């Protein structure tokens, strides 16, 4: 039914602003919400059917120390949506304590759109991991969000914060955010700033406006993830229907992203399926092997050859996916979305459960381990001491991330009929 | 002119021999049926009234003259035979289809049918002809999928009639657009196909077994007069490798003369005789034609087939009980080499 | 425009409608529609289209609708459900199966032949041959979704695994369910492995 | 099926770079791997069907003290292939000890492409004999290569290093390399730097850029050796099918090269066959007589006259080839390769087993004998002493090369039904 989206932090507000602009550009609408004359499709998934034939997006804005919010304010995309949801540190503990005192008023902002909506389906979170203002605040609000409504779903769009060296408190912040990301979130789509920066320096020669182009990438991914919902499809026209197949085990919910063209500034089915399969078109970067893959295709595609394509990708036999119980790489096929001009027609997006993210988790765990052992980089503040005097929240997150690495590695084993 | 049947109620279908003329010479009486036949399947319509005018002039004449009559028959034969030639070579693309026929029957492509033997070495049993038949088509297409013709060509199908004694290959051709290609013609192509696979198979075996270097002499000094089989591998290989090369000349010469004759002539009736010389030349000249020579060569092939198994199962240096069979083999090679000098004289 | 919508009664909008029914009465359905098996639908056809669209066509639509509703039921039942992990092994072991059947029937059959059918009917310029092309749609889709034959040789296993979709919802025993499923699934595969010709598109797992 | 190629040493990297460039120039491709619009043929023999419709060559790069590797790096033929296989003395003992310690990581480089390949057919070695960096390292890696995989074939492209006087340790290095070249290699194509230098000073007036033009010669030879494999042929479309006929005795595997035009900057069949037969078009320089010759022709050739050509070259009766069991000069005929412009159409290449290379072996054996007897030119290093304290590896190579000269000379005799 109806999904309410959330954005917090300056990076999260940037990606949400770009997402709403990019769906305004996709749909046959004006930047005021007025429908165009050439419209149809389903436009109730994130757009409130507002009072002047406006499709107002339902977006929760959360900001602290507003810098980008003024730039969002003086724009012709503030006439598209304005639900009056604006409500005013760089540490996780500081953001946690600042979210502590004002939770009731932003919760009134939540309940306003909750009662304004007739139905509710899920909550999408635009949150920047170790983002300074976003960190701590987003973790606290995530905790209150899943506490209040256990009848809904949570997706969180996350980045892996490390530019490979800078800030020494960031592994603590991302670790505490990762603890809540495990136990208070039901689906996590993780992105790599390193992998996106490498692909941006690959296809182009830009490395300085990286945020602006990464906005374009994430908005395309988020729109392609929702095209079967926003346009009349048949399967996973709800969020939960999409989330259900991918997760065999309720803590194995980390979702890998790839995309079949790399440069965006006739081919057949099994071709782009095979290219989406490769890790060098995967834009997020002992054995590591996939649990289950789901893929969506959108473009000009001849539909009758897909079964022979399915056979050819089968006998090509590219991944030795899993031992114990049988998953698959699973296809979904969609139409290329109308109501806008379309270049680079054949475009695919893949959602996969892969244990290879345990390597990145062990990377930031090793960074935390060396910074904890050196003990000159915790940056002891009264915020962190008053939040936790013995700093055993780090210990709880540490044993939980150990359990998750154990879960990954024992799932990679042929025996996960015993738990571990 | 109209190509209309029901012209004789009482005293495809053809004309009966009882009512066939002998006061008109018989070849001229053969051409009349062909001209009537081609209509059933341009400017044929444009000159129809002129043919009716000539035939009407023949109706006018009191007298009968074959010397006059034949010119009418020949003049119509030119255009009607030209029309089919004008269509099929270019618009049904005869020549490329002939190349495909050579690729798959005369093994103008042999890349597929070698790797096919690599992935279907599990046929030595008597088939039940209900399970192996499915498996051979599965293996065929699956072998094709790895490389080379990964876009279409599901047109040929394998099917069985050891697992190689039963074998058959089909290819549906466009039957209205190919009356030159007939099921009998494909039957002869099938016979040549089966022989050409037999020769490749036994030779692939024998060339594979020579790894005496590669695994059986490395870091060893081997025992002489125990590790030797008279080295008859090298003798048996020659009579297959030179024959292998002989088929290349035999093939390319006949392919070239056929593609020369077809270019020269501009009537389909000629193309019939050109094709009908071509296939018989393949048969007689590769000595697949039923001869005593064919028997002697089949004996050679059987001896090589048995010899490969003995050299296969031995592996690491061992000489016990293999010598007893090997003695029979070297005696048989002497016996058959004497026949190879009978084909020479 | 009527004709595409008619067979678009199945194949969202009806999604919310079917999901409310999952958690009896014929007016209780009706107000929900206006906003394991069952679901009678009734709809009027205008008479200039009634003389072209047969009465039996509605019945065939109803048959395939009736079979698919059970797959939607099983799909949604394992959707809302989100020694200890053994339930999760039992989750994947059936979730894979129901996803394959779902994908098979509705994309591979009910979308392939329909996209062909739309291209077919625009070449119909005669009243009578329109009836023959729509019957040539029905009589082949009634073969791909096989109900004319083997309703007790193949269909029985499809029936009996749907009762597992009933059992797994109640148990929100366990060893005795996989003991059944690994048996009947392998029997289904080892019979359908050589089978009318299009059923080999399911003989892959 | 699929063949993996190897190159080591600066000379081997030069000839491999030229070979890959020359096959890029032959095939209808870009220097990025992109197919051209006028393409067909078989392009899986050394080219990985890569991920952007790239035909990436499968080449193992091995380098020590990188000089030419940087020049290979800054080139538009590093966009053709880049499998990231680059991994960093002038003695055989020094190169042997340097290969000793790092064998596992370069073996991981081997196994990477081994698992990356679906099938495996053979290993081609580009190795420079007594090349300084190449010597010792190539011998060690050859030993490990045939040790690991006895189910494949080894070809080694070799030069005869002597510019007829310089370096006094070179006969020891080439001798130890020749020991491994005998007993750890299954097919050796030997080239003469003297003969190639003489032909280069013959057809032209160049003697200073000899390496650059010799690159052109060897790349043409290597492409002409593989034309029946790369283009749709009928016989010896695998390496082993080619190697099988030429070798009657598993240590008689040394292959002689000639080429029918000498200058490259209508004739009939038996003409160019006869000219390929002569030793003055052979570009590698008691009785000496051929065991068996194989020849390939590529050009504009009228195919129906080849049997009368065969008769005419028979009754011309140019070589009294062998006593005991019957070999032949054996013809193969190929089409001239399309997809590139073709000057000097009629070109033939011959592979032959000739005992005349025993003369060159006795030449370097006599050089080793005089340098060993004088005993001021061994250049005693701790590398050579620690590798072998008594230097009996030279003795083992000496008795083996004696056995090989004996094998040559007794094969020249009418009796080789007794061994020797």
UniProtKB/Swiss-Prot annotation, chains A, D:
Annotated Pfam families: Tubulin, Tubulin_C
Entry binding sites for GTP: 130-136
Disease in which the protein is involved: Cortical dysplasia, complex, with other brain malformations 4: A disorder of aberrant neuronal migration and disturbed axonal guidance. Clinical features include early-onset seizures, microcephaly, spastic tetraplegia, and various malformations of cortical development, such as agyria, posterior or frontal pachygyria, thick cortex, and subcortical band heterotopia and thin corpus callosum in some patients.
Annotated phenotype, changing residue 360 to P: In CDCBM4; the chaperonin-dependent folding and hence the yield of monomeric gamma-tubulin is compromised
Phosphoserine found at: 119
Subunit structure: Component of the gamma-tubulin ring complex (gTuRC) consisting of TUBGCP2, TUBGCP3, TUBGCP4, TUBGCP5 and TUBGCP6 and gamma-tubulin TUBG1 or TUBG2. TUBGCP2, TUBGCP3, TUBGCP4, TUBGCP5 and TUBGCP6 assemble in a 5:5:2:1:1 stoichiometry; each is associated with a gamma-tubulin, thereby arranging 14 gamma-tubulins in a helical manner. Gamma-tubulin at the first position is blocked by TUBGCP3 at the last position, allowing 13 protafilaments to grow into a microtubule.
Keyword Lipid biosynthesis: no
Mod. after translation: Phosphorylation at Ser-119 by BRSK1 regulates centrosome duplication, possibly by mediating relocation of gamma-tubulin and its associated proteins from the cytoplasm to the centrosome.
SMART domains given in the database record: Tubulin, Tubulin_C
Gene3D superfamilies: Helix hairpin bin (1.10.287.600), Tubulin/FtsZ, C-terminal domain (3.30.1330.20), Tubulin/FtsZ, GTPase domain (3.40.50.1440)
Organism for this UniProt entry: Homo sapiens
Homology family: Belongs to the tubulin family.
UniProt-annotated location(s): Cytoplasm, Cytoskeleton, Microtubule organizing center, Centrosome; Cytoplasm, Cytoskeleton, Spindle
UniProt keyword annotations, A-Z: Cytoplasm, Cytoskeleton, Disease variant, GTP-binding, Lissencephaly, Microtubule, Nucleotide-binding, Phosphoprotein
Protein name as annotated: Tubulin gamma-1 chain
Classification via CDD domains: gamma_tubulin
Swiss-Prot record, chain B:
A GO cellular component annotation in the UniProt record: spindle pole
UniProt subcellular location: Cytoplasm, Cytoskeleton, Microtubule organizing center, Centrosome
Keywords of this entry: Cytoplasm, Cytoskeleton, Intellectual disability, Microtubule, Primary microcephaly
GO biological process: cytoplasmic microtubule organization; meiotic cell cycle; microtubule nucleation; mitotic cell cycle; protein-containing complex assembly; spindle assembly
GO molecular-function terms, A-Z: gamma-tubulin binding; structural constituent of cytoskeleton
Tissue specificity of this protein: Ubiquitously expressed.
Subunit structure: Component of the gamma-tubulin ring complex (gTuRC) consisting of TUBGCP2, TUBGCP3, TUBGCP4, TUBGCP5 and TUBGCP6 and gamma-tubulin TUBG1 or TUBG2. TUBGCP2, TUBGCP3, TUBGCP4, TUBGCP5 and TUBGCP6 assemble in a 5:5:2:1:1 stoichiometry; each is associated with a gamma-tubulin, thereby arranging 14 gamma-tubulins in a helical manner. Gamma-tubulin at the first position is blocked by TUBGCP3 at the last position, allowing 13 protafilaments to grow into a microtubule.
Family, per entry: Belongs to the TUBGCP family.
The protein's role, per its UniProt record: Component of the gamma-tubulin ring complex (gTuRC) which mediates microtubule nucleation. The gTuRC regulates the minus-end nucleation of alpha-beta tubulin heterodimers that grow into microtubule protafilaments, a critical step in centrosome duplication and spindle formation.
Involvement in disorder: Microcephaly and chorioretinopathy, autosomal recessive, 3: A disorder characterized by congenital microcephaly and chorioretinal dysplasia associated with poor vision and nystagmus. Variable ocular anomalies include microphthalmia, retinal folding, retinal detachment, optic nerve hypoplasia, absence of retinal vessels, round areas of chorioretinal atrophy, and attenuated electroretinogram. Most patients have mild developmental delay and mild learning difficulties.
Organism: Homo sapiens (Human)
UniProtKB/Swiss-Prot annotation, chain C:
Location relative to the cell: Cytoplasm, Cytoskeleton, Microtubule organizing center, Centrosome
Tissue expr: Widely expressed, with highest levels in heart and skeletal muscle and moderate levels in brain.
Top-level taxon: Eukaryota
Role description: Component of the gamma-tubulin ring complex (gTuRC) which mediates microtubule nucleation. The gTuRC regulates the minus-end nucleation of alpha-beta tubulin heterodimers that grow into microtubule protafilaments, a critical step in centrosome duplication and spindle formation.
Subunit structure: Component of the gamma-tubulin ring complex (gTuRC) consisting of TUBGCP2, TUBGCP3, TUBGCP4, TUBGCP5 and TUBGCP6 and gamma-tubulin TUBG1 or TUBG2. TUBGCP2, TUBGCP3, TUBGCP4, TUBGCP5 and TUBGCP6 assemble in a 5:5:2:1:1 stoichiometry; each is associated with a gamma-tubulin, thereby arranging 14 gamma-tubulins in a helical manner. Gamma-tubulin at the first position is blocked by TUBGCP3 at the last position, allowing 13 protafilaments to grow into a microtubule.
Family according to the record: Belongs to the TUBGCP family.
Annotated protein name in UniProt: Gamma-tubulin complex component 5
Full-length numbering of the shown residues: 718 to 1016 of 1024
């Amino acid at each position: 039914r109806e999904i309410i989206t959330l954005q917090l932090g300056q990076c999260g507000n940037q990606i949400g602003f770009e997402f709403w602009k990019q769906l305004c550009a996709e749909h046959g609408i004006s930047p005021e919400g007025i429908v165009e004359e050439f419209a149809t499709d389903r436009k109730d998934v994130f757009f409130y059917q507002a009072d002047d034939e406006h499709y107002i997006p339902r977006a929760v804005l959360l900001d602290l120390e507003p810098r980008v919010i003024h730039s969002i304010l003086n724009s012709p995309y503030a006439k598209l949506y304005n639900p009056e949801n604006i409500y005013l540190g760089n540490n996780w503990a500081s953001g946690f304590s600042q979210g502590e005192k004002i939770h009731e008023d932003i919760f009134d902002i939540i309940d306003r759109e909750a009662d304004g909506s007739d139905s509710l389906e899920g909550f999408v979170l635009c949150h920047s991991i170790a983002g300074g203002t976003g960190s701590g605040l987003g973790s606290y609000l995530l905790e209150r969000l899943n506490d209040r409504y256990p009848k809904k779903l949570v997706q969180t769009y996350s980045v892996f914060p490390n530019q490979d060296e800078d800030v020494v408190v960031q592994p603590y912040n991302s670790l505490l955010t990762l603890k809540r990301l495990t136990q208070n979130a039901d689906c996590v789509v993780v992105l790599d700033n390193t992998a996106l920066n490498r692909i941006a320096t690959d296809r182009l020669h830009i490395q300085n406006p990286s945020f602006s182009q990464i906005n374009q990438l994430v908005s395309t991914i988020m729109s392609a993830s929702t095209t079967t919902l926003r346009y009349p499809g048949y399967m996973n026209n709800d969020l939960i229907g999409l989330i259900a197949s991918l997760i065999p085990t309720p803590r194995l919910h980390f979702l890998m992203t790839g995309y079949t063209p790399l440069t965006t500034d006739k081919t057949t089915v099994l071709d782009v399926m095979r290219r989406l399969l490769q890790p060098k078109n995967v834009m997020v970067s002992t054995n590591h092997c996939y649990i289950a893959i789901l893929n969506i295709i959108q473009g000009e595609v001849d539909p009758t050859q897909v079964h022979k394509s399915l056979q050819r990708i089968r006998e090509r036999k590219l991944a030795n996916f899993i031992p114990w119980g049988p998953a698959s790489i699973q296809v979904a096929l969609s139409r290329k979305s109308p109501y806008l001009p379309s270049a680079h027609r054949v475009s695919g997006l893949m959602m996969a459960n892969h244990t290879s993210i345990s390597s990145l988790f062990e990377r930031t765990c090793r960074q935390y381990d060396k910074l904890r052992k050196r003990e000159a980089f915790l940056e002891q503040f009264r915020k962190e001491d008053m939040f936790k005097d013995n700093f055993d929240e780090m210990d709880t997150s540490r044993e939980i991330v150990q359990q998750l690495i154990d879960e990954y590695h024992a799932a990679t084993r042929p025996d996960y009929i015993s738990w571990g | 002119l109209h190509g209309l049947l029901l012209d004789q109620h009482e005293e495809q279908f053809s004309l009966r021999v009882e009512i066939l003329p002998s006061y008109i010479p018989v070849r001229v009486a053969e051409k009349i049926l062909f001209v009537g036949e081609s209509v059933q399947m341009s400017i044929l319509k444009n000159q129809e009234d002129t043919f009716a005018a000539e035939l009407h002039r023949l109706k006018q004449q009191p007298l009968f003259s074959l010397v006059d009559f034949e010119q009418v028959v020949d003049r119509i034969r030119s255009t009607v035979a030209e029309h089919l030639w004008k269509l099929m070579v270019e618009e049904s693309d005869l020549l490329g289809q002939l190349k495909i026929i050579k690729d798959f029957y005369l093994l103008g492509r042999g890349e597929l049918f070698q790797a096919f033997i690599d992935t279907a070495q599990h046929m030595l049993k008597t088939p039940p002809t209900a399970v192996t038949e499915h498996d051979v088509n599965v293996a065929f297409q699956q072998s094709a999928h790895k490389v080379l013709l990964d876009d279409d060509n599901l047109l040929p199908l394998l099917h069985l009639t050891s697992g190689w004694a039963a074998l058959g290959l089909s290819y549906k051709v466009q039957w209205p657009l190919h009356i030159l290609f007939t099921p009998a013609v494909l039957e002869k192509y099938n016979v040549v196909f089966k022989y050409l696979l037999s020769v490749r198979r036994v030779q692939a075996e024998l060339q594979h077994c020579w790894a005496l270097q590669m695994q059986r002499k490395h870091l060893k000094s081997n025992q002489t007069d125990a590790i030797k089989w008279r080295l008859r591998n090298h003798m048996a290989f020659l009579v297959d490798n030179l024959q292998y090369y002989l088929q290349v000349d035999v093939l390319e010469s006949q392919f070239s003369q056929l593609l020369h004759q077809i270019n020269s002539t501009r009537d389909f009736e000629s193309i019939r005789l050109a094709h009908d010389h071509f296939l018989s030349n393949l048969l007689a000249q590769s000595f697949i034609l039923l001869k005593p020579v064919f028997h002697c060569l089949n004996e050679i092939l059987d001896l090589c087939h048995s010899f490969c198994s003995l050299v296969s199962q031995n592996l690491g240096p061992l000489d016990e009980r293999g010598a007893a069979q090997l003695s029979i083999l070297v005696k048989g090679f002497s016996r058959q080499s004497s026949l190879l000098f009978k084909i020479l004289s | 425009e009527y004709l595409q919508a008619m067979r678009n009664f199945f194949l969202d909008t009806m999604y919310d409608f079917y999901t409310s029914i999952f958690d009896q009465n014929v007016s209780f359905l009706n107000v929900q529609l206006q906003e394991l098996d069952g679901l009678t639908l009734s709809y009027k056809v205008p008479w200039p289209v009634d003389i072209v669209i047969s009465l039996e066509c509605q019945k065939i639509y109803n048959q395939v609708f009736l079979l698919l509703l059970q797959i939607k039921w099983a799909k949604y039942s394992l959707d809302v459900l989100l020694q200890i992990h053994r339930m999760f092994l039992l989750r994947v072991k059936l979730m894979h199966f129901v996803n394959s059947l779902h994908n098979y029937i509705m994309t591979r059959i009910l979308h392939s032949t329909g996209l062909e059918f739309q291209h077919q009917v625009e070449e119909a310029k005669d009243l009578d041959q329109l009836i023959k092309i729509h019957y040539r749609y029905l009589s082949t889709i009634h073969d791909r979704c096989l109900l004319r034959e083997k309703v007790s040789f193949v269909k029985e296993a499809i029936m009996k695994v749907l009762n597992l979709a009933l059992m797994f919802a109640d148990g929100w025993s366990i060893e005795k369910m996989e003991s059944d499923f690994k048996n009947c699934h392998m029997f289904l595969v080892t019979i359908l492995n050589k089978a009318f010709p299009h059923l080999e598109s399911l003989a892959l797992s």
